Amino acid sequence: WIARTFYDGPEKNYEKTMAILQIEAEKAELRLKELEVRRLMRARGDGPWYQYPTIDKALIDHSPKTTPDN
Amino acid sequence: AGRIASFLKNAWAKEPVLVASFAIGGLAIILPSLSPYTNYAIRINRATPYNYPVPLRDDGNMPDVPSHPQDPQGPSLEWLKNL
Ligand SMILES: CCCCCCCCCCCCCCCCC[C@@H](O)O[C@H](CO[C@H](O)CCCCCCCCCCCCCCC)COP(=O)(O)OCC[N+](C)(C)C
Ligand SMILES: CCCCCCCC/C=C\CCCCCCCC(=O)O[C@H](COC(=O)CCCCCCC/C=C/CCCCCCCC)COP(=O)(O)OCCN
DSSP states (O other): OHHHHHOOOHHHHHHHHHHHHHHHHHHHHHHHHHHHHHHHHHHHOOSSTTOOOOOOGGGOOOSOOSSTTO | OHHHHHHHHHHHTTOHHHHHHHHHHHHHHHGGGTOTHHHHHHHHHHTOOOSOOOOOOOOSOOSSSOSSTTSSOSOOOHHHHHO
């Protein structure tokens, strides 16, 4: 009576634990991947992150400048 | 109307310097927006050649660009002479 009224079967806890373990394992591998990606991006600078600003080339004046040799 | 005129009359007495200064300042602020010769002054400033006019590379498709200074093509400064 106690088992029927207050508790459930072992399969419920078993599968819940499996789902939780899978979720946490994916989270851990994602954290490692994010750390590695951050390290590589900061070391190289070829990714969208750590793109420090540079001088815009649209500000340059392309016209004769009173002197042929610029 | 009447109050403003009375205030102006009172200020014109015993305080002519401030009234004259304010009138001159207001005129100097307002008039240039109405004067038609400011465009003439801008044109004169733009028509003053400070740098050497660098020639363009002719490609056979430049009808508005003259080939010689005496050619009719190009801007004219006859209006400046007429002033
Ligand atoms: C002859 C009898 C001998 C044995 C006597 C046993 C006595 C048992 C009383 C002790 C109860 C406490 C154990 C569990 C309580 C909470 C556990 C909880 O999970 O159970 C809830 C149910 O518990 C009851 O609602 C609460 C128990 C309280 C009743 C005790 C009686 C005396 C209380 C005094 C009240 C005061 C009244 C006013 C006094 C003036 C809901 O369960 P649920 O999470 O959905 O489970 C889902 C699985 N399903 C689908 C199979 C159901
Ligand atoms: C919108 C244009 C703005 C730019 C123009 C102004 C250029 C600079 C002129 C102003 C310089 C500073 C002015 C500071 C004003 C202070 C006035 C003040 O406090 O003096 C009062 C008294 O001054 C006054 O009476 C109040 C202001 C006077 C009237 C000001 C002119 C208002 C507008 C008049 C002109 C309107 C437009 C022109 C109409 C004329 C017709 C063409 C106290 O006098 P005391 O020296 O302390 O003497 C005390 C001991 N007896």
